[PDB]
Amino acid sequence: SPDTSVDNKVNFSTDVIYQIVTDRFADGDRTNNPAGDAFSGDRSNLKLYFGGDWQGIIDKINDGYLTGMGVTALWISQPVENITSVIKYSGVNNTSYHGYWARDFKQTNDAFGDFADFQNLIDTAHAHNIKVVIDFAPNHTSPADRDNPGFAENGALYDNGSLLGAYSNDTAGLFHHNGGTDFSTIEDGIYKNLYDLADINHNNNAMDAYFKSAIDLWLGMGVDGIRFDAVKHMPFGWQKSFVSSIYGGDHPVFTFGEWYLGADQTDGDNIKFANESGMNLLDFEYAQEVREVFRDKTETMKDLYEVLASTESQYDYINNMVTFIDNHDMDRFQVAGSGTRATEQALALTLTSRGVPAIYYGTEQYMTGDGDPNNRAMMTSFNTGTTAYKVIQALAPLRKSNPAIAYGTTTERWVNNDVLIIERKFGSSAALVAINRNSSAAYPISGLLSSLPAGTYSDVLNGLLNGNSITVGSGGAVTNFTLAAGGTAVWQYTAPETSPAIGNVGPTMGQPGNIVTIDGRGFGGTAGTVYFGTTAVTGSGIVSWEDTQIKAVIPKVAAGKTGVSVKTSSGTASNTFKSFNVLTGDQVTVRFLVNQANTNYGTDVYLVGNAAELGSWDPNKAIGPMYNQVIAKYPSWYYDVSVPAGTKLDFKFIKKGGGTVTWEGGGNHTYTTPASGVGTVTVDWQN
Ligand SMILES: [Ca+2]
Ligand SMILES: [Ca+2]
Ligand SMILES: [Ca+2]
Ligand SMILES: [Ca+2]
Numbered sequence: 105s106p107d108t109s110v111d112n113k114v115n116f117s118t119d120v121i122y123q124i125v126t127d128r129f130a131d132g133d134r135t136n137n138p139a140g141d142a143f144s145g146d147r148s149n150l151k152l153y154f155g156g157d158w159q160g161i162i163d164k165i166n167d168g169y170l171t172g173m174g175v176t177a178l179w180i181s182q183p184v185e186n187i188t189s190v191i192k193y194s195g196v197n198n199t200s201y202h203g204y205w206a207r208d209f210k211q212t213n214d215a216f217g218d219f220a221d222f223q224n225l226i227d228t229a230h231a232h233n234i235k236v237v238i239d240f241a242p243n244h245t246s247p248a249d250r251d252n253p254g255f256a257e258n259g260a261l262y263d264n265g266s267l268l269g270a271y272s273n274d275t276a277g278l279f280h281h282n283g284g285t286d287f288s289t290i291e292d293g294i295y296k297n298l299y300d301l302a303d304i305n306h307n308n309n310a311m312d313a314y315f316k317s318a319i320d321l322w323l324g325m326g327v328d329g330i331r332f333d334a335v336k337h338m339p340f341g342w343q344k345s346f347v348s349s350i351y352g353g354d355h356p357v358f359t360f361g362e363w364y365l366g367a368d369q370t371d372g373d374n375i376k377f378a379n380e381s382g383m384n385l386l387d388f389e390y391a392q393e394v395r396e397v398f399r400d401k402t403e404t405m406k407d408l409y410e411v412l413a414s415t416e417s418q419y420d421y422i423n424n425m426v427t428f429i430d431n432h433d434m435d436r437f438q439v440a441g442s443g444t445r446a447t448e449q450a451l452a453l454t455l456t457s458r459g460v461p462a463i464y465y466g467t468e469q470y471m472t473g474d475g476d477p478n479n480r481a482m483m484t485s486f487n488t489g490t491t492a493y494k495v496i497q498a499l500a501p502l503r504k505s506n507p508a509i510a511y512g513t514t515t516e517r518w519v520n521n522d523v524l525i526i527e528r529k530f531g532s533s534a535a536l537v538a539i540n541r542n543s544s545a546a547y548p549i550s551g552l553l554s555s556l557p558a559g560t561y562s563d564v565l566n567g568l569l570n571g572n573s574i575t576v577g578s579g580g581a582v583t584n585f586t587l588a589a590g591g592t593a594v595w596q597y598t599a600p601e602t603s604p605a606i607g608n609v610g611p612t613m614g615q616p617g618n619i620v621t622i623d624g625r626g627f628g629g630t631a632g633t634v635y636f637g638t639t640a641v642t643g644s645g646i647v648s649w650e651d652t653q654i655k656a657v658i659p660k661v662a663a664g665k666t667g668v669s670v671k672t673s674s675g676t677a678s679n680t681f682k683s684f685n686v687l688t689g690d691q692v693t694v695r696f697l698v699n700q701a702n703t704n705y706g707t708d709v710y711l712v713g714n715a716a717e718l719g720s721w722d723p724n725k726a727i728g729p730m731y732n733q734v735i736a737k738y739p740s741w742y743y744d745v746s747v748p749a750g751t752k753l754d755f756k757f758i759k760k761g762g763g764t765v766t767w768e769g770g771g772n773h774t775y776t777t778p779a780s781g782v783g784t785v786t787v788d789w790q791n
Contacts, residue, residue, distance in 0.1 A: 107607070107623035107652040108504045110176075110233040113328040113357045114610035114621045117423040118510040119176040119235060120455065120500040121462035125432055126181040126216050127153055127201040129465055129483050130160025138215055141190045142199050150477040151198045152190075158217040158225045165228050169486045173493060174500030177235035179331055179462065183222060183322065185211035187246045187257040202432075202480075203239060204333065205246035205301075208262040209318035219325075226326040235328035237358075242315045242346075243334040244301035248272070250281065259302030263314060271302045280305050282734055285337075290373055293337045295734040306342040307695050307744065309781040316349055323355035332383060335361030336373075340381055342782070344613075344746035345691040347382045351611045352618050352690060358610065360384040360426050360460075364433075367392040370414070379420045382613035382685070387425035387459060389415055394429050394453065398446040398541060399437055404521035405541065412514060412526075416458075420683045423511060423608050425459035430467065435474040437467060444470050445590045448495050448569055449539050452592050455499040456528065456537045458514050468492040491568060498565050499594060506598045507625055508533040511607025517554060523547050523587060529555050530607065531625060532599035536561075538571070540591040552582040561595040569593070601625035604678040609668050614658045615687040615748075619647055622654040622670060624678070632673040636686065637666040663688040663716035688715050688748035694775075694783040695735070697742045698757050701789040706761045709741045713755035717747045723758055723765050730757075739789075750779045757789065 105111045108118050137143060137155045144152035161178065164170050170178070185208040186200035203213060212219055229236050248259030248271035260270040261278060269278045280303040285296040297303045304311055319330070330350075335343060347359050361381075363374045365388035378385040393411040396403040416422050429450045430437040437447055447470060454461045466483050468490055473479045487493070503510045512530030519525070522542040528535045534555045540547055556576045563571035571593025575583040587593070607624040614620055622634065631649040634641040634656040647655035654670060667680035701709050708729030712719050719725035727745055732738035747753060753775050759766040770790035777783055 105653065106650065110230055110235055112621065112623070112653065113235065113355070115608045115623050116177065116235075116329065116358045116460045117608055118503050119460060120174060120496070120503060121177045121179050121237065121426070121460065122170060122173070122175040122465065123179045123428075123431060123462050124161060124181070124465045125156075125480050126158070126161070126203065127156045128480050129156040130164055131155035131157060132159030132161070132163045133157050133217070136215055136217060138188075138199070141197055142188070147482060149197065150480060151196060151201070153199050153201045153215055154482055156482070157215060158221045162225055162228045164486070165232055165234065169488065170234070171232055172488050173468070173496045175463070175496070176233065176500070176504070177237055177329065178229060179237040179329075180239065181216070182206065182239040182241055182333075183212060183216060184209045184318075186213050189257050191247055191256050200246070204241050206241060207246060207257060207260055208265065209242075209315065210264045210321055211262075223325055230326065236326070237329035237331055238322060238327050239331045239333055240319065241333035242304060242306075243338050244298060244303050246302065247300045248302040249300065268310065268314070276310060277305055277308055278311055279303055289733070290336065291731045291733055294339055298334065298337060306339060306693070307782055307784070312342075312693070312781045315346065319350065320353060320355070323350070323353070323357060327357065329358040329360075332359060332361040335377065335383065335385075336363050339693070339744035340377060341744035341746045342693045343383060344381050345693040347611075348613065348615065348687060348691040348746065351382070351614050356611055356619065358384070360386060360424070362386050363388065365389055365392065367396060370418075375418050379683070380685070382611060384421060384424040384426065384612075387415065387427045390425065390427050390457075390459075391429060394450050395434075395437070398450045399439065405519055405524040405539075406521060408524060409516050409519050412457075416514065421612050422458050423460075424612070426462050427454050427457060427459045428462045428464065429454055430464050430479070432464070432480055433476060434479065436472050436479050437464075438470045438472045440472045443543070444491065445543065445569070446541075448492055449541060449590075449592050451492060451495050452499060452565070452569065452594070453537070453539060455496065456502065456509055456535060456594060458528070461500075461503075463496065468496060494568055495565065498568065502535070502564065502594070502596065506533055506535055506596050507531070507607060508535045508596070508598070511624070518549060518552050520547070523549075525549070525552060527554055531601045531603065531605045533597060535594060535596040538587055538591065538593050540587045540589065543590050546586050546588045546591065548584065548586050549582070550584045554580045554582055556580055556595065556597050561597070564594040564596060565592065604628070604670055604672050604676055606668070606670065606678050606681050609681040609684060612683075613685040613687060615689050615691070616658050616660045618658045619655055620658060622656065622668065622681075623652060625652055627651050627654055627670060628672045628674065630673045633671040635669040635671065636661050636684070658686060661686055664720070686716075688717060688751065690749045691717075691746045692749045692778045692781060692783060693744055694747050694777055694785060695742055695744050696730075696755075697736055697740060697784070697786040698730075699740045699786070699788055701741055701757060701759070702739045703759055707759050707764070707766075708761065710758050710760055711743060711745065711755060712758060713753050715748055715751060715753060717745065718753065718755055723760060726758060726760070747777050749777055751777045753777060757787070
């Protein structure tokens, strides 16, 4: 099957995701509706269950509402069994309608449906060439008070109905007992509770095995992708080990996490997580800037382009960014009393930009509402006639048919404070997008250049947003035209590639023997070579080959980041996909601890070692800076690190800072890592 097939679970940049809060979308089965104080019949209390369920999603696929839009993936509320108790929070009864208060990750939330309902949703979606993404929240269970067991359900955790433990009587050490976080540092937000949510201890072997087992069940039923909740509040090392076990399992899938960023904020740890964790990220820098430019008018088109360029240079895998313009935690894009063209233009930009676009349910019906839970009202209408519906219908399928939009580079061709003209290019295909946010003034466009070959191009939107046709001359020169007030147009050209061209490689990280997927154009029908760096993969090591997709087995090659490329059976080479990170083997998570390592202000302890996962003795690739506040206290330091299973590691600790790099004295430390799960090592500093 080709790169655009619904069967391609690891690469999503040809898709458009529709994000559904399950309880708030469509009640297709009133018999699974919660009863009593847990249900809001008149929808007065938006913290209660309203009744939306998987059957309702199934109905809106079959009757064509969701298919009519060109949407090709559905991202749904965490499917797992939640607590069924109603919690009073400052006078207001609250429920698990949102799906984030888990108690059994191996059972369904019966409000949404049973396991047969879930398999039907998967089946109806795939049958319509729609992928299914689930929220997954392994950070915590549910609200709990350690010193008052009676509150809620004490954050209890069941395994197929059998109680592994609760917060108040936690003899196995399943949870952290370190208080609640004040969000003051990243370390503080990982190893402590988020509000009153019982924080899982993933340095526990039973917890590592539990979540690996639980995710495999959902992936076994055909789930195509995972939205990891709260990735800022779990150890980076555990998450890298966790997604490496997915990529090495039977069901490699696209994964991405939520790492919130505020407006005008960039964060080095966010960047490092997106580039090194093996998991991708929701693109908050893009989302906040688009909101500023179109919704709030607190930035201009020039500022928007600057963010497009700075995200491109800082993120290694820009086609994996999941872009959006709002979600279930922000104010709705549509502001009561504003017009709808801001929504329309923001969608048009997002649907044609690099990455993986995601649309929050009801965006296309101009739903309004500020803050949680007002931004989670019941879907107001299924009107397929709104301009926004038709904008998505027109432009989402371009991601499947034009490889410039799914894979291509991004180049500004014209920019002032109100107008942005952007070109996407991939080999012989290209797309040109023009947007004028000024609602009372048209702008003449003169001397615009493009990569479009000569001829006359009609607007893909056909004037729905006051766009126009253009005439392109010899050198990609675009004949003078006027971009109308509020105007938005898309012009495109797609041509069959003749040279092999890689658009994406998924997953982005893997140990030898994993199956990776290479998507692009012009690979030929018959098998050729795949080049992990300088080493060739042919014959047995190619699982399947065709013109837009190759599946291949990672070869036993030096661990570390490397380029991936293909040569056709006619000996023709491709471009190289940058920074594929080969692992040494399967991963475990080890907590490394070092004592009596004192430092002055501005100097941090780091971990170096022999395996690539430990930097290969490069203090430039050292792991850290380590932590010293919560799990263990300065002058003790600790860090949770993804390292190869069953492996004799040699390592030392170092002290680096503004210039100086101090090394550990004596001989090396040595440790054989576990064959599965998680581990720990405690060492003394050596002067
Ligand atoms: Ca229902
Ligand atoms: Ca249909
Ligand atoms: Ca945590
Ligand atoms: Ca600003």
